[PDB]
Amino acid sequence: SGALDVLQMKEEDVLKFLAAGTHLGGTNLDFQMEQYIYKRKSDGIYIINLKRTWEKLLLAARAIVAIENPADVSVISSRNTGQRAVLKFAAATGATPIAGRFTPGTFTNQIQTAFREPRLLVVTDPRADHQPLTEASYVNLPTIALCNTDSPLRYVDIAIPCNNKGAHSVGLMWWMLAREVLRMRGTISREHPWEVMPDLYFYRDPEEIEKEEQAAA
Amino acid sequence: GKCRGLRTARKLRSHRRDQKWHDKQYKKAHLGTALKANPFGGASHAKGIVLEKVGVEAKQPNSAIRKCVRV
Amino acid sequence: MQNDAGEFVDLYVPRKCSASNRIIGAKDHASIQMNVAEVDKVTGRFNGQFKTYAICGAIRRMGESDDSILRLAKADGIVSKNF
Amino acid sequence: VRMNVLADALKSINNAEKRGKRQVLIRPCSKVIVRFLTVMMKHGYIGEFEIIDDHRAGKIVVNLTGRLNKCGVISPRFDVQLKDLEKWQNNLLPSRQFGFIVLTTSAGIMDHEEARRKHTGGKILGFFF
Amino acid sequence: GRVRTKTVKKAARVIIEKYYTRLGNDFHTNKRVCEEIAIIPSKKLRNKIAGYVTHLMKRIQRGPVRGISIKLQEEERERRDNYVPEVSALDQEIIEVDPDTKEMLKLLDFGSLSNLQVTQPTVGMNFKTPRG
Amino acid sequence: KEWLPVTKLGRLVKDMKIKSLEEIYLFSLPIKESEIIDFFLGASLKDEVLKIMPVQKQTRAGQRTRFKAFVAIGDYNGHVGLGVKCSKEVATAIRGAIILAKLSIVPVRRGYWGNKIGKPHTVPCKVTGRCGSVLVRLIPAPRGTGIVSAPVPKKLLMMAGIDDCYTSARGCTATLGNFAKATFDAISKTYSYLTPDLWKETVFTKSPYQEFTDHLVKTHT
Amino acid sequence: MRAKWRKKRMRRLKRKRRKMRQRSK
Amino acid sequence: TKKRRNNGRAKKGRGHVQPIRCTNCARCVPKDKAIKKFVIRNIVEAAAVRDISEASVFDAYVLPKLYVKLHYCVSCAIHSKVVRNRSREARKDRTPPPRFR
RNA sequence: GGUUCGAAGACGAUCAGAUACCGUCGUAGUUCCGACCAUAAACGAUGCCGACCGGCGAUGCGGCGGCGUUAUUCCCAUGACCCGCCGGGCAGCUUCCGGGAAACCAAAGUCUUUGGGUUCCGGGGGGAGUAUGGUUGCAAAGCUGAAACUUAAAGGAAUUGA
């Protein structure tokens, strides 16, 4: 994860976190997350720490490298912000996504024919994605979650600090992980800048399709 | 126990005596009124001169005249 | 778990939490096992080995599940010192 | 008023074990409680600790190993015999395999396993299993 | 009270889903396109089904119908899933940074950036809206 | 007549691989199948019925009756159950309480009163168990005493394996359901009571999902 | 019989008797 | 058996409060316990905001509102259906009903 | 000292009958100054002093730190608005700290893992706060306060129905 200038944060990964707006946190605060916070602005916005982004982007991407079968990874977003960020992710690591609407009693219930049984849960937001995680109790499920300063920490085993509500911010955190797992396997080089573009993983609003199809000519 | 001191020993012991007189199967025991009332006076059997035969009715649900004596 | 004569009598040794020293019971589901991968110091790739851990069911819903793995990580040199 | 010190401290550490702090600060400190503490850290039910001499009475910062279900005290300190120590232990420690009863003898504050070797009864302070 | 039971709409979306090509708007023609292929044991039940069809065939001409996929707008759904822009949203030269975000990055090695247009936060720390 | 196992841990068992459910107990993985438990202990297992209880629910035309089967089980050597089920006839209720128990079996500890020379014979320390408002307690006790208690929590222990033990009790014992529930939980609390024979640390082994991962990609979806 | 209106009734048939037991002095 | 936490009345620093006469009945009710309302109302409501404006004196005029403060006992409230009974969690909602039109 | 109200009373309506609701009057009383009386669901139906065990959004009193508007213009500091820090106060919200028979309680928690110090008090229902004696008062009444006899249920919190 660190000490090693073979896994370290690059000059080519500072002007993507700033340009999207992932460091820009909130006003309210839960008592657990004050060890990922630098200092408050005069305006009312919590600036999230950026060394503790990289040192906690690779540990999580250290568990997914320690996971044995590509299938078992249950990736989720209910919310419509990053549902093109959990499906293209599946089109790089070979996970099993469930985007849009969780059918409760998925993990817990046998007799159904939607019957799942993963070994890791990578969920885009604990607060919204509530029903996922309580199920992560009744069967034992080492959990990951892209949390914020706001949310409570019920059934999660790592807390990655970032602004996870925006259009530029959710889909940018779903490429590095997939980058930094694929680099940790040897399928993309640490050398060649990775051929895929970061805008492949942001979800498309129905208001900028009327901008893009209608203005091409 | 509630008054936990090391030299209380009497405070503790004036309170239970006081108390046990509230106990029924005891006060019924520790006053002279139980044996003043009682026909046998304090005893397991005691003989007597009959004087008339008498039928007593029974109480409800049940009914049937019950055959008694007056001694 | 013996008599005098040293022979191991009790039918299974349970797990124990790597965080707090509380034994992880048999009908305790919000348990966890989590392996974490190691990575070659010059190559930046998987070595073929990990650094396992565990967390019990009483600690997760209490709130302190994401500040016990970092107190166990850090100390085995996975994560750097200053953080 | 704080009529009796020990039992401030002894619940405190227990209530920092149920919850589970890495260490516990316990406020006004004595030569019975630091003493008791060393008897515990002689059988492994806690680890090493530091006392903080502020010119009043000390504070103490123990480090709590999670090998500690409950600590407790007895009050008042009754007067025990060598003929009358079975029927504490036999009603105050859990098992015949583990448990300890600290008391105070003329020849020192110590555990009930040792006061049967030195053949000395005396008072009683608390227990730990 | 003309509302149709689940026997109808079950067998309508299951007849639009596969044969969207053959079918259409006319009631009197899909009255035959519903009968050639299927098994339907009543002429009244035959007519209920074959006209909700026409009720449902005019709703593919405006928006995406919920309980049913088709091969024409399911490729054009995924058209946008396979979109990539030409100039990226994040790789920008003139980026904005505050005098607290300037002093936290400089604590790390990134301490003399040539493309940080260092700015200021608006003076006065009132933000909240009143109560009632 | 086939056993067609659905889950990932049950398909493994059905292939004769994961050997001796002490291995599943270690990993705390939740059993929701019947035959696993039938497959490991089986003919070593003996059931009973302690009480069938009726209950009702006032409707507008009379009322609906039903019957309630609490059922005991567990080998004369270290594991037991205590399931319950409610249905509209009795041998439905019986059958489907047997199965629901076998589900929640648990493996009992046991130890020595005093001296150590032979075998383990009682509840290794003073443990208490409750449900509702019946508080059972299980005090350790010397050889050939026997089980000193009431009919209910005698007919768990006897089987359990715990051979000699002094009890206590509280509360409304007539509310059998609770009692029988109160002493089971209790024995559930032998393997979660930490002594200094278990202060020696944990050395981790491997879950059955991780080692059997290439075999399960080829045998069931 | 409500409580308060019973405790009138003990209170009215005690105050009569205090007339009675007076006269016999 | 207990049903409300704050027992029918806002009072936690006092012991005794001052009484107020119910304006439908005339019952004494504890200031805090009461149901209160406030009414602001032009002397023309909807129908009579038309006849006067064409046969009036002043070039551009405004009429006065009529301000009352009401006070209800509990059953005076309930009879006149200013307020309902409510379900057990529902109860809680001190969030007042929405006044848009 | 007697405006209003208003136990007792007089009428009018009401009803099978109403010495009850409503309606018209109206005494004792309602209000002051003096001395008695000592009880109320006198309530949080919840002893006082002590330690300890979570998270937040308000609020009142006192003290301290800090951008910027506004007032006295001439600014020194005092008032008014703005974001925290600490102490004592009345309440809230959130939650697998924990408890309980549940409702529910950050106390009603730290209780078969049963001991921080100390004061009042209950021991199945009625009979019965009765009789009696002693006590206190002008009086009504207040503090203390039994027995013979009488009976397998009173009762609590929650379910479904009607």
Do the strands D126-128 and D100-105 form a parallel or antiparallel pair, or are they unpaired? antiparallel
Mark whether D64 and D119 lie in a shared domain: no
**CB within 8 Å: F109 and C10:** yes
Chain C residue numbers with beta carbons less than 8 Å from the beta carbon of D67 are 21
Q: Which of B6, B7, B12 to mutate to test the interface with D (most CBs of D within 10 A)?
A: B6
Looking at residue A12, what DSSP letter applies? G
Task: CATH number of the domain at D114, please.
Answer: 3.30.1490.10
- Cα H58 to Cα H47, H50, H53, H65, distances in angstroms: 21, 15, 10, 18
Helices (H) and strands (E) in chain B, counts: 3, 2
Based on the fold, state whether residues D81 and D117 are members of the same structural domain: yes
CA-wise closest residue to A182 among A195, A163, A165: A195
Contact D8, D28 (CB under 8 A): yes
Q: Strands F48-58, F63-73: parallel, antiparallel or unpaired by DSSP?
A: antiparallel
Q: Rounded to an integer, what distance in angstroms lies between the CA atom of residue F26 and that of residue F203?
A: 12
Find residue F58's DSSP bridge partners.
F63
Residue from the list F6, F7, F217 with its beta carbon closest to the beta carbon of A69: F217
| Nearest residue in chain D measured CA to CA from B8 | D76
Residue with tokens 């019946």: F134
Domains for chain C: give ranges and CATH numbers: 1-82 (3.30.1230.20)
Domain end: D68, D100, D119, which one? Answer: D68
Count, residues in chain H: 101
CATH of the domain at D9: 3.30.1370.30
Clarify whether residues D80 and D120 are in a common domain: yes
Which residues lie closer than 8 Å to E13 by C-beta, 6 or more apart? Answer: E56, E65, E67, E68
Q: How many whole angstroms separate alpha carbon H82 and alpha carbon H101?
A: 17
CA of B30 to C1' of I64 (A): 72
Taking the CA of residue F23 and the C1' sugar atom of nucleotide I93, their distance in angstroms comes to: 46
In contact, D103 and D122? CB cutoff 8 Å: yes
F175-188 core/surface letters (b: 16 or more CB in 10 A; e: else): ebbbbbbbbbbbbb
For tokens 């989590």, name the residue.
Answer: C34
Contacts of D66 in chain C (CB under 8 A): 20-22
Provide the token pair at A30: 């839960």
Q: CA nearest A58 in C: which residue?
A: C79
Distance H29 CA to I37 C1' (A): 29
Resolution, in Å, please?
Answer: 3.2
Neighbours of A104 (CB within 10 A): 12
CA distance A92 to D114: 67
Report d(CA D119, CA A66) in Å as an integer. 60
Neighbouring-strand partners of residue F49: F71
Minimum distance, in Å, between the CA of residue E127 and any CA atom of chain A: 7
E69 φ, ψ to 5°?
A: -110, 160
| Antiparallel, parallel or unpaired: β A73-77 and A96-99 | parallel
DSSP state of B17: H
Angle at A130 between CA A128 and CA A132, to 5 degrees: 120
What is the C-alpha separation between E71 and E17, in angstroms, rounded?
9
Which domain, by its residues, includes D47? 1-68
**Token couple for A173:** 């955190």
Q: What is the dihedral of CA A64, A70, A74, A78, to 10 degrees?
A: 100
Q: CA D106 → CA D39, D121, D127, E57, E99, distances in Å?
A: 16, 9, 19, 101, 69
My answer on whether D55 and D82 are in the same domain is: no
Q: Which two tokens stand for residue H75?
A: 């059953």
SS in 3 state form for D39-100? HHCCCCCCCCCEEECCCCCCEEEECCCCCCCCEEECCCCCCECCCCCHHHHCCCCCCCCCCE
The subunits that touch chain G, with at least 3 C-beta pairs less than 8 Å apart, are: none
Chain A interface includes F28 (CB < 8 A): yes
Beta strands in F114-199 (DSSP E): 127-130, 135-140, 147-148, 165-167
Q: How many residues are recorded in chain E?
A: 132
Query: Are D66 and C20 contacting, i.e. CB atoms less than 8 angstroms apart?
Result: yes
Considering all nucleic acid strands, name the nucleotide whose C1' atom is nearest to the C-alpha of residue B38: I148
Phi-psi label, residue D35: left if phi above 0, alpha if psi -120 to 50, beta otherwise: alpha
DSSP string across A38-90: EEE-SSS-EEEPSHHHHTTTTTHHHHHHH-S-STTEEEEE-STTSSSSSSTTH
Distance CA A133, CA A124 (A): 11
Q: Which domain holds residue E52?
A: 6-61
Domain check: are D8 and D56 in the same one? Answer: yes
Residue with tokens 């001191």: B5
Residues 6+ apart with CB under 8 A from C9: C1, C2, C3, F119, F120
Structure tokens at D109: 């504050």
Q: Are C38 and A58 in contact (CB under 8 A)?
A: no
**CA–CA distance, C9 with F197 (Å, rounded to integer):** 12
Q: How many folded domains does chain D comprise?
A: 2
CATH number of the structural domain spanning residue E53 = 1.10.60.20
D47/D26 same-domain check: yes
What is the full DSSP assignment across H64-87? PEEEEEEEE-HHHHHHTTSS----
- Measured distance CA(D109)–CA(D122) in Å, rounded: 10
What 8-state DSSP symbol labels residue F31? P
Rounded CA gap, A78 and A203, in Å? Answer: 13
How far apart CA D115 and CA F133 sit, in angstroms, is: 41
Do B55 and B68 touch, CB atoms closer than 8 A? yes
Which string of DSSP letters, residue by residue, matches chain E?
A: -----HHHHHHHHHHHTT-TTT--S-HHHHHHHTTTTS----HHHHHHHHHHHHHHHTSTTTS--TT---TTTTHHHHHHHT---SS-SS--SSEEE-TTHHHHHTTSS--S-TTEEE--PPS---------
Using a 7 Å CB cutoff, list residues 14-73 of H near strand I.
15
Nearest residue, CA→C1' of I122:
B22
Report residue G15 as tokens.
């105050």
As to burial, measured by CB atoms within 10 angstroms (0-12 exposed, 13-18 middle, 19+ buried), residue F138 is buried
Q: What span, in angstroms and rounded, lies between the C-alpha atoms of C8 and A72?
A: 38
* Pair (D57, D16) in one structural domain: yes
User: Helix E43-57 crosses helix E6-16 at what angle (to 10 degrees)?
Assistant: 60
Query: For residues E10 and E118, what is the distance between their CA atoms, to the nearest angstrom?
Result: 62
Q: How was this structure determined?
A: cryo-EM
Q: Which residues of H are annotated as a binding site for Zn(2+)?
A: 22, 25, 73, 76
Secondary structure element (H or E) that encloses residue C73, with its range: helix C69-73
**Measured distance CA(D31)–CA(D37) in Å, rounded:** 10
Q: How far is CA B71 from CA B44, B68, F71, in A?
A: 16, 10, 59
**D95 and D48 inside one domain:** no
- How far apart, in whole angstroms, are the C-alpha atoms of residue F202 and residue C18? 8
Is chain A adjacent to chain C, meaning 3+ CB pairs within 8 angstroms?
yes
F221: Cβ contacts below 8 Å, ≥ 6 apart = none
**Any idea what DSSP says for residue A148?**
-
Q: Are A153 and A147 in contact (CB under 8 A)?
A: yes
| Torsions phi, psi for F8 (to 5 deg) | -80, -35
Q: Residues D46, D76: one domain? A: no
All chains having 3 or more CB pairs closer than 8 angstroms to chain E: A
Q: Nearest-CA residue to the C1' of I121?
A: B19
